Scaffold this active site. Structure first.
Site, PDB file in Angstrom:
ATOM      1  N   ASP A   1      -8.789  -1.180  -7.281  1.00  0.00           N
ATOM      2  CA  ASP A   1      -8.148  -1.286  -6.139  1.00  0.00           C
ATOM      3  C   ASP A   1      -7.508  -2.750  -6.149  1.00  0.00           C
ATOM      4  O   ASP A   1      -6.344  -2.944  -5.377  1.00  0.00           O
ATOM      5  CB  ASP A   1      -8.853  -1.209  -4.994  1.00  0.00           C
ATOM      6  CG  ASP A   1      -8.216  -1.106  -3.607  1.00  0.00           C
ATOM      7  OD1 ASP A   1      -6.956  -0.720  -3.506  1.00  0.00           O
ATOM      8  OD2 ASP A   1      -8.560  -1.357  -2.487  1.00  0.00           O
TER       9      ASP A   1
ATOM     10  N   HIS B   1       0.987  -1.296  -0.030  1.00  0.00           N
ATOM     11  CA  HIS B   1       0.015   0.041   0.046  1.00  0.00           C
ATOM     12  C   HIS B   1       0.910   1.180   0.020  1.00  0.00           C
ATOM     13  O   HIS B   1       1.053   2.060   0.948  1.00  0.00           O
ATOM     14  CB  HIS B   1      -1.018   0.041   0.997  1.00  0.00           C
ATOM     15  CG  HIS B   1      -1.911  -0.980   1.178  1.00  0.00           C
ATOM     16  ND1 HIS B   1      -2.018  -2.113   2.079  1.00  0.00           N
ATOM     17  CD2 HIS B   1      -3.011  -1.221   0.349  1.00  0.00           C
ATOM     18  CE1 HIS B   1      -3.307  -3.007   1.928  1.00  0.00           C
ATOM     19  NE2 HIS B   1      -3.806  -2.325   0.824  1.00  0.00           N
TER      20      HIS B   1
ATOM     21  N   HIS C   1       1.225   1.538  -5.823  1.00  0.00           N
ATOM     22  CA  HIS C   1       0.036   1.061  -5.764  1.00  0.00           C
ATOM     23  C   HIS C   1      -1.066   2.068  -6.175  1.00  0.00           C
ATOM     24  O   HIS C   1      -1.780   1.825  -7.041  1.00  0.00           O
ATOM     25  CB  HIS C   1      -0.416   0.494  -4.234  1.00  0.00           C
ATOM     26  CG  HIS C   1      -1.887   0.209  -4.084  1.00  0.00           C
ATOM     27  ND1 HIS C   1      -2.506  -0.818  -4.974  1.00  0.00           N
ATOM     28  CD2 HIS C   1      -2.668   0.485  -3.215  1.00  0.00           C
ATOM     29  CE1 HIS C   1      -3.559  -1.248  -4.647  1.00  0.00           C
ATOM     30  NE2 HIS C   1      -4.005  -0.216  -3.565  1.00  0.00           N
TER      31      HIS C   1
ATOM     32  N   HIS D   1      -6.161   7.263  -2.765  1.00  0.00           N
ATOM     33  CA  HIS D   1      -7.046   6.313  -2.154  1.00  0.00           C
ATOM     34  C   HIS D   1      -6.620   5.544  -0.917  1.00  0.00           C
ATOM     35  O   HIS D   1      -7.230   4.942   0.046  1.00  0.00           O
ATOM     36  CB  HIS D   1      -7.745   5.215  -3.195  1.00  0.00           C
ATOM     37  CG  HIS D   1      -6.953   3.895  -3.183  1.00  0.00           C
ATOM     38  ND1 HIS D   1      -5.781   3.913  -3.982  1.00  0.00           N
ATOM     39  CD2 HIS D   1      -7.174   2.629  -2.805  1.00  0.00           C
ATOM     40  CE1 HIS D   1      -5.274   2.601  -4.002  1.00  0.00           C
ATOM     41  NE2 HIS D   1      -6.175   2.001  -3.363  1.00  0.00           N
ATOM     42  N   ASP D   2      -5.297   5.265  -0.740  1.00  0.00           N
ATOM     43  CA  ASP D   2      -4.540   4.771   0.327  1.00  0.00           C
ATOM     44  C   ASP D   2      -3.598   5.804   0.775  1.00  0.00           C
ATOM     45  O   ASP D   2      -2.334   5.312   1.547  1.00  0.00           O
ATOM     46  CB  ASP D   2      -3.860   3.437   0.073  1.00  0.00           C
ATOM     47  CG  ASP D   2      -5.031   2.329  -0.009  1.00  0.00           C
ATOM     48  OD1 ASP D   2      -5.681   2.291   0.962  1.00  0.00           O
ATOM     49  OD2 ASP D   2      -4.851   1.506  -1.131  1.00  0.00           O
TER      50      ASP D   2
ATOM     51  N   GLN E   1      -5.346 -18.066  -2.464  1.00  0.00           N
ATOM     52  CA  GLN E   1      -5.521 -17.130  -3.692  1.00  0.00           C
ATOM     53  C   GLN E   1      -6.778 -17.721  -4.473  1.00  0.00           C
ATOM     54  O   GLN E   1      -7.669 -16.957  -4.576  1.00  0.00           O
ATOM     55  CB  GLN E   1      -4.396 -17.054  -4.425  1.00  0.00           C
ATOM     56  CG  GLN E   1      -2.998 -16.337  -4.038  1.00  0.00           C
ATOM     57  CD  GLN E   1      -3.343 -14.667  -4.236  1.00  0.00           C
ATOM     58  OE1 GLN E   1      -3.081 -14.365  -5.426  1.00  0.00           O
ATOM     59  NE2 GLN E   1      -3.716 -13.994  -3.253  1.00  0.00           N
TER      60      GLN E   1
END
Ligand SMILES: [Mg+2]
Ligand SMILES: [Zn+2]
Length: 324
Positions: free
Chosen positions: A228, A79, A83, A117-118, A280
């Protein structure tokens, strides 16, 4: 409490020219920014100009915003500054393929909201900060870091010459902050599941409708989760390398739990490396494929995101088979 960018940083960004062999490849969904680290701020500039226009933002102000955003991102494994642009590029590629479906004020909001956004992610998830009574978690009962990302976004604007929305009227100023706020809270994965089911429920009945504002926000919310998590839509070796960044941030967060005495969830346990492929496989089935399936149904020309996710699911399936 906000790192102000230097003149040398944003001056060199104004002067930056995009190479002509990237002008072509920026448009494609699968495009991986990774290789062009020194060019990333200017690629966000290019993406704004191609979507919104050259006179959309005052270039001097926009370059302060970008390089002060970059400065406010920390150097955690996943993050981080890298990113922000990968997610902002996915949005660009969606917006390009569905352009007059959205407004110019929405175009301005979603790319800016994607790049912010982060902002100031500490490496730690919501549940960690809530379970150990962190000052941010006390400040925000639900969606802890997402509200902090929106706060840091608004703090950047209020610095000297950073307010890219000065030329908008205050009607559209509070609209663009509400689009940005709504888009940044949507990135909390907790709300995606309700968001997807609802939009699937709205799609199948036939009751979905774009100028119905409540539906418009849910549609924009899904786009912000699709973006995202867009690392799953890239090429196979790029995706494998990105997931290794994601787990490196998870496992550090799990190291902090083992010190305090409580053993973490297997995803954040670094002893559970064996479970990764099966973990995953679960993530792609219960989250990723579902995300890009309902995305492709609302917006047909975002299918490559779903196509490349099917491709990477096959590769993760083959890793459990013992092929790799
Ligand atoms: Mg987040
Ligand atoms: Zn994110």
């Amino acid at each position: 409490h906000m790192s102000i960018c230097t003149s040398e940083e944003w001056q060199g960004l104004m002067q930056f020219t995009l190479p002509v062999r990237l002008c072509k490849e920026i448009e494609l969904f699968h495009f991986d920014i990774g290789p062009f680290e020194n060019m990333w701020p200017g690629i966000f500039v290019y993406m704004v100009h191609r979507s919104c226009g050259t006179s959309c933002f005052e270039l001097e102000k926009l370059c302060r915003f970008i390089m002060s955003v970059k400065k406010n991102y920390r150097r955690v494994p996943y993050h981080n500054w890298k990113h922000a642009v990968t997610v902002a590029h996915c949005m660009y590629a969606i917006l390009q393929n569905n352009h007059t479906l959205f407004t110019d004020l929405e175009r301005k909001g979603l790319l800016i909201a994607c790049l912010c956004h982060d902002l100031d992610h500490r490496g730690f998830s919501n549940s960690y900060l809530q379970k150990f009574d962190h000052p941010l978690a006390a400040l925000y009962s639900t969606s802890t870091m997402e509200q902090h990302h929106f706060s840091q976004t608004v703090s950047i604007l209020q610095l000297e010459g950073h307010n890219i929305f000065s030329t908008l009227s205050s009607s559209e100023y509070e609209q663009v902050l509400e689009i940005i706020r709504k888009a940044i809270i949507a990135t909390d994965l907790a709300l995606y599941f309700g968001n997807r089911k609802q939009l699937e429920e709205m799609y199948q009945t036939g009751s979905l409708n774009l100028n119905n504002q409540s539906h418009r926000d849910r549609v924009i919310g899904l786009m912000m989760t699709a973006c995202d998590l867009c690392s799953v839509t890239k090429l196979w070796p790029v995706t494998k390398l990105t997931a290794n960044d994601i787990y490196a941030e998870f496992w550090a967060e799990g190291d902090e739990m083992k010190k305090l005495g409580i053993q973490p969830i297997p995803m954040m346990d670094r002893d559970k490396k064996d479970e990764v492929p099966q973990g995953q496989l679960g993530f792609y089935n219960a989250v990723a494929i579902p995300c890009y399936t309902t995305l492709t149904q609302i917006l047909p020309p975002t299918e490559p995101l779903l196509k490349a996710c099917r491709d990477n699911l096959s590769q993760w399936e083959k890793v459990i088979r013992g092929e790799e």
